[PDB]
Amino acid sequence: AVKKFKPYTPSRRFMTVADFSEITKTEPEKSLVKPLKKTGGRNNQGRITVRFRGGGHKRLYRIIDFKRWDKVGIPAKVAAIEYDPNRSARIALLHYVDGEKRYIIAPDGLQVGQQVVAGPDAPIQVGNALPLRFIPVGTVVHAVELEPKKGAKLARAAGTSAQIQGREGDYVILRLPSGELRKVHGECYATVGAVGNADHKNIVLGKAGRSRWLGRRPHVRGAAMNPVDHPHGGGEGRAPRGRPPASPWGWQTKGLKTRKRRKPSSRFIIAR
Amino acid sequence: MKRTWQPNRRKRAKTHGFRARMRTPGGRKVLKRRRQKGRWRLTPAVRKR
RNA sequence: UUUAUGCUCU
RNA sequence: CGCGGGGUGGAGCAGCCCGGUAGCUCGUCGGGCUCAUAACCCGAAGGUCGUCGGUUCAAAUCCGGCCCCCGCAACCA
RNA sequence: CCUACGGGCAGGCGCCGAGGGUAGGGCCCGUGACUGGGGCGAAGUCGUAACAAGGUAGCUGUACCGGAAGGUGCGGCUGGAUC
RNA sequence: CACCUCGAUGUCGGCUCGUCGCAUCCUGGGGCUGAAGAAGGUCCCAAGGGUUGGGCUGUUCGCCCAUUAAAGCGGCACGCG
RNA sequence: UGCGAAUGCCGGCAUGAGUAACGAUAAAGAGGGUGAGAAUCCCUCUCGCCGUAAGCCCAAGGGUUCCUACGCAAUGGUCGUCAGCGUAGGGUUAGGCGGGACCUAAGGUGAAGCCGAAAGGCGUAGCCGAAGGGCAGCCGGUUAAUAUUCCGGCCCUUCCCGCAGGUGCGAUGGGGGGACGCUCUAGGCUAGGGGGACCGGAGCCAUGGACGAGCCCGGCCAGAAGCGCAGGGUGGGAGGUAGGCAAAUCCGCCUCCCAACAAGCUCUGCGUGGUGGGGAAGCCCGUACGGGUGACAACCCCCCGAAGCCAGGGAGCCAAGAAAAGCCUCUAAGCACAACCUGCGGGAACCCGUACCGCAAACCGACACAGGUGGGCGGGUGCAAGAGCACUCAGGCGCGCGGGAGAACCCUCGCCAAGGAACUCUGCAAGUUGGCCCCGUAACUUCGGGAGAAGGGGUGCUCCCUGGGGUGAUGAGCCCCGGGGAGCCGCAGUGAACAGGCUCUGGCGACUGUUUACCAAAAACACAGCUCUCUGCGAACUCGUAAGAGGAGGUAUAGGGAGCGACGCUUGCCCGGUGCCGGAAGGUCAAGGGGAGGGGUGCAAGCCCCGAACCGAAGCCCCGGUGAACGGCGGCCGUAACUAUAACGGUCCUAAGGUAGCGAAAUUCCUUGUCGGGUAAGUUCCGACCUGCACGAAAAGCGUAACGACCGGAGCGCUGUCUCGGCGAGGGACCCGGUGAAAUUGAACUGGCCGUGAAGAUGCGGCCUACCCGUGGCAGGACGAAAAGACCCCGUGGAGCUUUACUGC
RNA sequence: GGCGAGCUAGCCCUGGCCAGGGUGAAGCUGGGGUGAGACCCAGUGGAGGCCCGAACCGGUGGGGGAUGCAAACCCCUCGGA
RNA sequence: CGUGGUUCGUGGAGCCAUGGGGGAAUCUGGGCGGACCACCGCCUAAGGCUAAGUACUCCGGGUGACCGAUAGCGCACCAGU
Numbered sequence A: 001a002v003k004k005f006k007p008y009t010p011s012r013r014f015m016t017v018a019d020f021s022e023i024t025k026t027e028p029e030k031s032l033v034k035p036l037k038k039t040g041g042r043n044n045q046g047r048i049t050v051r052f053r054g055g056g057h058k059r060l061y062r063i064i065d066f067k068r069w070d071k072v073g074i075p076a077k078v079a080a081i082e083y084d085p086n087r088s089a090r091i092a093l094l095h096y097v098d099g100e101k102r103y104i105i106a107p108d109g110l111q112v113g114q115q116v117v118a119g120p121d122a123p124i125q126v127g128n129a130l131p132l133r134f135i136p137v138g139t140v141v142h143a144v145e146l147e148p149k150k151g152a153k154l155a156r157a158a159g160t161s162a163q164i165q166g167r168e169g170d171y172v173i174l175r176l177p178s179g180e181l182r183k184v185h186g187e188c189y190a191t192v193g194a195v196g197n198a199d200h201k202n203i204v205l206g207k208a209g210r211s212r213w214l215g216r217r218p219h220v221r222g223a224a225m226n227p228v229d230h231p232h233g234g235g236e237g238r239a240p241r242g243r244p245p246a247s248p249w250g251w252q253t254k255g256l257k258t259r260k261r262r263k264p265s266s267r268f269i270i271a272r
Numbered sequence B: 001m002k003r004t005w006q007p008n009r010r011k012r013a014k015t016h017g018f019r020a021r022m023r024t025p026g027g028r029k030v031l032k033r034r035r036q037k038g039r040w041r042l043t044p045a046v047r048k049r
Numbered sequence C: 001u002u003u004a005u006g007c008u009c010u
Numbered sequence D: 001c002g003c004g005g006g007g008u009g010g011a012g013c014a015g016c017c018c019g020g021u022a023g024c025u026c027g028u029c030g031g032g033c034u035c036a037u038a039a040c041c042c043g044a045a046g047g048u049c050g051u052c053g054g055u056u057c058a059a060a061u062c063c064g065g066c067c068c069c070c071g072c073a074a075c076c077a
Numbered sequence E: 001c002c003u004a005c006g007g008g009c010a011g012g013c014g015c016c017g018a019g020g021g022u023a024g025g026g027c028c029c030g031u032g033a034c035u036g037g038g039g040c041g042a043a044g045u046c047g048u049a050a051c052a053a054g055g056u057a058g059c060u061g062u063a064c065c066g067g068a069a070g071g072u073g074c075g076g077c078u079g080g081a082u083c
Numbered sequence F: 001c002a003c004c005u006c007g008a009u010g011u012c013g014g015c016u017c018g019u020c021g022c023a024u025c026c027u028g029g030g031g032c033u034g035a036a037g038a039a040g041g042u043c044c045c046a047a048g049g050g051u052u053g054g055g056c057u058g059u060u061c062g063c064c065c066a067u068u069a070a071a072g073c074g075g076c077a078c079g080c081g
Numbered sequence G: 001u002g003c004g005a006a007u008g009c010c011g012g013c014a015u016g017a018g019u020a021a022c023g024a025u026a027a028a029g030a031g032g033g034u035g036a037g038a039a040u041c042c043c044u045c046u047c048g049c050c051g052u053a054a055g056c057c058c059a060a061g062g063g064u065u066c067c068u069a070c071g072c073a074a075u076g077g078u079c080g081u082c083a084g085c086g087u088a089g090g091g092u093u094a095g096g097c098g099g100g101a102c103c104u105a106a107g108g109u110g111a112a113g114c115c116g117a118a119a120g121g122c123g124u125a126g127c128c129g130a131a132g133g134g135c136a137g138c139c140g141g142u143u144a145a146u147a148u149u150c151c152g153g154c155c156c157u158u159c160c161c162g163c164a165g166g167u168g169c170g171a172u173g174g175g176g177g178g179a180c181g182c183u184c185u186a187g188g189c190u191a192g193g194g195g196g197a198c199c200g201g202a203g204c205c206a207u208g209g210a211c212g213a214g215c216c217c218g219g220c221c222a223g224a225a226g227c228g229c230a231g232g233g234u235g236g237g238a239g240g241u242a243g244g245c246a247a248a249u250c251c252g253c254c255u256c257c258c259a260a261c262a263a264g265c266u267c268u269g270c271g272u273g274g275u276g277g278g279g280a281a282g283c284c285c286g287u288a289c290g291g292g293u294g295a296c297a298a299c300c301c302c303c304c305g306a307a308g309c310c311a312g313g314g315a316g317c318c319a320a321g322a323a324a325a326g327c328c329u330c331u332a333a334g335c336a337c338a339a340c341c342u343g344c345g346g347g348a349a350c351c352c353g354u355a356c357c358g359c360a361a362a363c364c365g366a367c368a369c370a371g372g373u374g375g376g377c378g379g380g381u382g383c384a385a386g387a388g389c390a391c392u393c394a395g396g397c398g399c400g401c402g403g404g405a406g407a408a409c410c411c412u413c414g415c416c417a418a419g420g421a422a423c424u425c426u427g428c429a430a431g432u433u434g435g436c437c438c439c440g441u442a443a444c445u446u447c448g449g450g451a452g453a454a455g456g457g458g459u460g461c462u463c464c465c466u467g468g469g470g471u472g473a474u475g476a477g478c479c480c481c482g483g484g485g486a487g488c489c490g491c492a493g494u495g496a497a498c499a500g501g502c503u504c505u506g507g508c509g510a511c512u513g514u515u516u517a518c519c520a521a522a523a524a525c526a527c528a529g530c531u532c533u534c535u536g537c538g539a540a541c542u543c544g545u546a547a548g549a550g551g552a553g554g555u556a557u558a559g560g561g562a563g564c565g566a567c568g569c570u571u572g573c574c575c576g577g578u579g580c581c582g583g584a585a586g587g588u589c590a591a592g593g594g595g596a597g598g599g600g601u602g603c604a605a606g607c608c609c610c611g612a613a614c615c616g617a618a619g620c621c622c623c624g625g626u627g628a629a630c631g632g633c634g635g636c637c638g639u640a641a642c643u644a645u646a647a648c649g650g651u652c653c654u655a656a657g658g659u660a661g662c663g664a665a666a667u668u669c670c671u672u673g674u675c676g677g678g679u680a681a682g683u684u685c686c687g688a689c690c691u692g693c694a695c696g697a698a699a700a701g702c703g704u705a706a707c708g709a710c711c712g713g714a715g716c717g718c719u720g721u722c723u724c725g726g727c728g729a730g731g732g733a734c735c736c737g738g739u740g741a742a743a744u745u746g747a748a749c750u751g752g753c754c755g756u757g758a759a760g761a762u763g764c765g766g767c768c769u770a771c772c773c774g775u776g777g778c779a780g781g782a783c784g785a786a787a788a789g790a791c792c793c794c795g796u797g798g799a800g801c802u803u804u805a806c807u808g809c
Numbered sequence H: 001g002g003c004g005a006g007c008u009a010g011c012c013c014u015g016g017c018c019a020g021g022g023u024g025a026a027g028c029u030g031g032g033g034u035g036a037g038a039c040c041c042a043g044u045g046g047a048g049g050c051c052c053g054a055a056c057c058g059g060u061g062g063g064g065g066a067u068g069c070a071a072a073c074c075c076c077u078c079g080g081a
Numbered sequence I: 001c002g003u004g005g006u007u008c009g010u011g012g013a014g015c016c017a018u019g020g021g022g023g024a025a026u027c028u029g030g031g032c033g034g035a036c037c038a039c040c041g042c043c044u045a046a047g048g049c050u051a052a053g054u055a056c057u058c059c060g061g062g063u064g065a066c067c068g069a070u071a072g073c074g075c076a077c078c079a080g081u
């Protein structure tokens, strides 16, 4: 669910928080397998290269396991489900029979205390990782690799997933969370199930400050600027765009496509 | 009201110090210039211990 | 597959 | 009194560049279909082209003055 | 003050108290620029929605739309004519 | 019109403080009346003094309320920063 | 090579002028002393001001300002005999305080490596980097000036060596730990404080009373082991093991078995502790201060009590809260007559800082400048509390010109008959209201609010009765919340100080918040939230020549761009033009390919030139799509049985002709539209109408409770705003002594009127008036000062900005 | 071509600060309620870009200052806390 | 093909240089004499060094129809203070 508040202040009236009942003995995280210190910095070497960032709560980085072939065959028990501030999804601490501990992005359903495993073997149930080629066509899946052995990249956002649609050569055909139909190599690992914490999309920040906590500084409209600053600056009492709506740097921002045309990747795609 | 000069001995050496001047080619010319002029002090005098 | 309408009181 | 566009059968529009003949829809009139009206069908009438002057062989048309119509302008002060 | 004085009376203070005052509520009646529909009214305007299968069967709850009656969608009723 | 002023002559209105003109708003004095009286009209003399308080608007001005003997018009760098 | 002008340059000296001013209105007076000289230096007494400071202690910064002697030319806004000033001499003492022979953070640097014309830019490890982590000293005494530094007492750290005991020792490597948020919080303590009839103490009895359980003063500090109280940390065995980049017996994981509890084992805090040390008032001396005594001082009970300690305590919550070393454990090479561990003993223990100022006369502001400057302490009484307010301790100050006088005028204050907004652009300003307890409280509403709504009553002191809590006993005392009854006094009881004026109704913005440092705080920005669009991840996008980096150690519930801007109800039609999106055709199209065909020169082989068809991308053309893409959303004429008006019609054009809802409005020109409401009167205000110059739906449309130092209209309250002023206070103005500027200044022997003049005359004409010179005052003129007009134009002057201007990158 | 973020703006790392009072969200417990619920009532609890108000951060209105104490100050008033 | 250099700014544009593509030969070889061809001549590219004559004046000296303390160097003087 999602937590609501009686309006005992404005903003608290619309404010809505995440449900943390799914969260098992978190609080203190697992200092070992993560965390590392997280270098919080809003610009590159010198200059701001992404506007409107900075501030917001300090964070410890949980170094999660986005490649599971690392431990083929070795099963493991799910010890806890934890809060991770560095992603929308929740994380699951799992103890391997090895005695090795690793975090995984907690899939929807994944219960505390169940066994998990990865490999060409691997029962087709929730939490288990397999090379795409060995997953029954039609199953939903998450944390997919885009190229073999390069680590998961796709469907890692809270509530996201991907469907295996068919096979074609050493490639299988996924339908990515974006809706794009893509061919991915069969050797690429995926893990069965959707991501979970899917109520995520339904929280309401409620106030300006709430955005400040997440590290988002106020965003100012070109419309409020001067010509020096933005295509939309200037006028003299409000103003339509007076030209095709543009970004501070001049390019159009309503329709104009941006994907590089001649791109090797193009040969493996087929949708929106 | 708070004026511009807010002395800080580290700031001063870290900024116009001799070593700072020698790292940058632009700084090495400041010393070149200052020396050629016969300046008595090639660098802001600073102290502390 | 082209039509709509018929002033007032007896 | 700045600039631009206009004024043509009863209504609303063309025709004006480039000269020489005024067209469209509606309406009006006469006849038909209907018990009857309208619709519908067959016919016909009707404009000197705001105005005075000028140009030409010839002026709605090109040129000038006057009277009306519409639009725009009247800023630094 | 009078005494038939461990008294009474006058007088004094106190409670409540008609009402007056101040402040805020409730109900009801009249009235108000303007505005909504309604009823009624011998011979006004626009159409034709319904009654015959009404010339798109009708009616219906709801929804959108339209000068107007209405039209259309969805589902419902027969209180629909026709072999 | 463009004559002094652009190495600067601060621009409306209000307030304050006035002062002057008379083409007189009131008060004084007159002639004429289509002046019975009372009350007016119109013109002449007259500048001594007086010439209200409010509502509206930044307003000047003006409309309005209540009065008044009257609620005068102007000039003074549209008097006066 | 000749100066009078350049708002010329450098310098000197003038004018204003003995004028303004002498820098917070906390405040002064006298006696004595010193001295050539004293309001200004010293001392005494009286008075006043600070006291969450204007007292005290740190960090910056400053750098002799520190202490003392001898000095007053200058510096000191006056004076100085004094000084933060001149001369000289002295003064800063550390194994434990801070920093370094420790750690890491952002960042910086940077073997490897990558990139760049050169300069140079990146960058893994490593190294540097601190107000973070780590680490051993507490109480007194002493100097003119330093002290956790010297001294005294008690107490600890590390290094080296050596004995003894013990163990597989051994690391830069593995593991543990260090180790972490915000809010609220428990128990027990400590600092701190109040009281005491108890303990110690010089003295005091005034002025009517008091020889009193009187008054006045003080009743502690530090301390090892041991011990006691409170609390933090922690399970103990065994087997298995494939993970923790080698190896571990360690950690991790699975299974057994015992504890379940601090029980124990530890580590802190507090108490006690051998001992050591401090120790008032007052009186006597001497200051320029401090010293003697009080003393053989006392040294104790009760109460209040932290935000500090036990500390890694506990609970709740979402935004999910450094690192590394010290440290412990594990093992590796190696070495195990090593080594490491424990205990004792002896020895060894370096560099830098240390004065003084430090909310300020010593720091930042040219000044002994009413400004600015981070952390700690910051006592008492009363007032509901408090760091608030008043008065006060300690301590520190009266602010470096004074003395008089009692005008206008100014500033800052106090009061005011009657009236009570009549003031004015506006109640601007000032008033009123004002704390706490109680009673009570509407529309509307998003059910929270609106609410401190509004409006009221109570408030002191005395005696009596009386209920609970804390600590103690289940008690007394001391604290802490109260409850009831009878009285007392004044004009007045939150008696002084600190403490909302209220209501009604519009506009804009939802809200808290943000902004033009120094004329705008707002209806502007931001904001949650809605939509569009781009982005499949070496993402898009941004910075960079690049390497590289941000995005992000993120992944479509994510990230970038854009507009809108809580929320409610909604957001209509046009794709013709522009943009974007799609379109394997067709048209055009550059280099290049291709060369029919022609040309120059050769005796020629040849060399060398042009050059048609044709094949050649993107782009444009062309065909479609697209509105929360740029954008746009008509005109004339007629018509109903009173008139009017026109549901209706005709016609012209369009890509389509503005829907809902609003509407003289933040928009309405005519305009103070018309009508209604408010007022005695209303250019504004509120409600309507619609003839909308020139509203209208995400440059959103129409509403909306709550909120606002926003802007408008009205009323109650109350007033010096006003009728309309008056009196009074203090700081100035004035006079006297001391010090003593400024802009400005062609030179001046500088009057009025009417004329004249480059058109506004002290300076010309005529007349008028007028003895010479000041002081206090007002501001009409010197087209007064100031700034080489900010407006305007001019210059083939400049700069910011725009675009379907040109040309480039 | 160099010098500047010791002022100011933003961000990164590490610390510190916010008297006192008021309002009383969720949750919890208990009770009622039901077939079971929703839910209602108490008490507990202690949420919030919540309220009043010092420090602290501000700079709303007015007055003063205008060769100033001050090249942005002082007083009163006011905003956040 | 793209550019630079030369007086040569695409010009009839050679020559020298060279970022890109293609790519030889060794005396009967190659370059040049201003597109190109012939003829006639000049010279031997893709390795390197080389005194002197030339430029300057921190420094020492000698001279001046050069200055003489507002001049002359910024500095005649403990001034790049």
Ligand SMILES: [Mg+2]
Pocket: A045
């Ligand atoms: Mg860097």
Ligand SMILES: [Mg+2]
Pocket: A045, A046
């Ligand atoms: Mg850098």
Ligand SMILES: [Mg+2]
Pocket: A201, A202
């Ligand atoms: Mg969302």
Ligand SMILES: [Mg+2]
Pocket: A219, A220, A221
């Ligand atoms: Mg924005």
Ligand SMILES: [Mg+2]
Pocket: A224, A225, A226
């Ligand atoms: Mg702007």
Ligand SMILES: [Mg+2]
Pocket: none
């Ligand atoms: Mg800029």
Ligand SMILES: [Mg+2]
Pocket: A227, A228, A230, A231
């Ligand atoms: Mg631009």
Ligand SMILES: [Mg+2]
Pocket: A231, A232, A233, A234, A235, A239, A240, A241, A242
């Ligand atoms: Mg624009």
Ligand SMILES: [Mg+2]
Pocket: A236, A237, A238
């Ligand atoms: Mg506009």
Ligand SMILES: [Mg+2]
Pocket: none
């Ligand atoms: Mg500050």
Ligand SMILES: [Mg+2]
Pocket: B005
């Ligand atoms: Mg300076």
Ligand SMILES: [Mg+2]
Pocket: B008, B009, B010
């Ligand atoms: Mg420093």
Ligand SMILES: [Mg+2]
Pocket: B011
């Ligand atoms: Mg700094």
Ligand SMILES: [Mg+2]
Pocket: B040
């Ligand atoms: Mg020297």
Ligand SMILES: [Mg+2]
Pocket: none
């Ligand atoms: Mg009909």
Ligand SMILES: [Mg+2]
Pocket: none
């Ligand atoms: Mg009939």
